[PDB]
Design a protein around this ligand. Structure first.
Ligand SMILES: O=S([O-])[O-]
Ligand SMILES: [Zn+2]
Length: 258
């Protein structure tokens, strides 16, 4: 019926409604560190999030998205392997039922507790909807989360979750600064891939940061209290909303570092 992460509508079933699921440039993938090619021609990433304007947080039934005003060049990503300017539209996470799983990308088969995705679209395309139809339309920054010390800049997000517990709920979420979610280093791996949920379009340049951020056990615990279902429906906790690693096929992962 409609896709999700259960036994009956989970990732292994998505291909029946979205045949691109078995495509040549699907994400996530496992990052084999010894096979990744250092590419000295890759430039440092440029993250300008000082003018970021967050607007709202929404539970869409598969994750929670923090949305930003993308009507002007306020929070952009450029540099790295990118040509042009990519504007931040939303961020969301993927997490597990246990601390040993939850990320989508893996590093030498290692899974992290969660994975943050900062989604950006290429301004040459004018809007998000046009950007997803192009091979270079989106740039997604992926950041792994491991459990350890709390991340102070994540607390504002954690505290509003009670208010968007079920599908379709939203809350005003202004003045949130996404700079509090970045690791210290911006070293990364990059490869051409896709969105990791339907419609699985192959329009993403992935930029996965090598350095994870730490979150406390209590912070990740609050993610696991959300619900996949709508209000008044039987409770299904929002956990394990990650797609497993897909075949690399004819692709090379490049590293910005050695
Ligand atoms: O942002 S990736 O989940 O499609
Ligand atoms: Zn994602």
């Amino acid at each position: 019926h409609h896709w999700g992460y259960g036994k009956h509508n989970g990732p292994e079933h998505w291909h029946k409604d979205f045949p691109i699921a078995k495509g040549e440039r699907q994400s996530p993938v496992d990052i084999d560190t010894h096979t990744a090619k250092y590419d000295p021609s890759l430039k440092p990433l440029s993250v300008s999030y000082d003018q970021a304007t967050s607007l709202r947080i929404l539970n869409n039934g598969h994750a929670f998205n923090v949305e930003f005003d993308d009507s002007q060049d306020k929070a952009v990503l450029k540099g790295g392997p990118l040509d042009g300017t990519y504007r931040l539209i939303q961020f969301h996470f993927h997490w597990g039922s246990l601390d040993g799983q939850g990320s989508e990308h893996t590093v030498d088969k290692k899974k992290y507790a969660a994975e943050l995705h900062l989604v950006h679209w290429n301004t040459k395309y004018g809007d998000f909807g046009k950007a997803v139809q192009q091979p270079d339309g989106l740039a997604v920054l992926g950041i792994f989360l491991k459990v350890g010390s709390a991340k102070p800049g994540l607390q504002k997000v954690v505290d509003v979750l009670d208010s968007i517990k079920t599908k379709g709920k939203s809350a005003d979420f202004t003045n949130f600064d996404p700079r509090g979610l970045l690791p210290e280093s911006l070293d990364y791996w990059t490869y051409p891939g896709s969105l990791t949920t339907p419609p699985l379009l192959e329009c993403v340049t992935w930029i996965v940061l090598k350095e994870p951020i730490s979150v406390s056990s209590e912070q990740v615990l609050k993610f696991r209290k959300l619900n996949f279902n709508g209000e008044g429906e039987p409770e299904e906790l929002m956990v394990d909303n990650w797609r497993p690693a897909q075949p690399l096929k004819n692709r090379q992962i490049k590293a910005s570092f050695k």
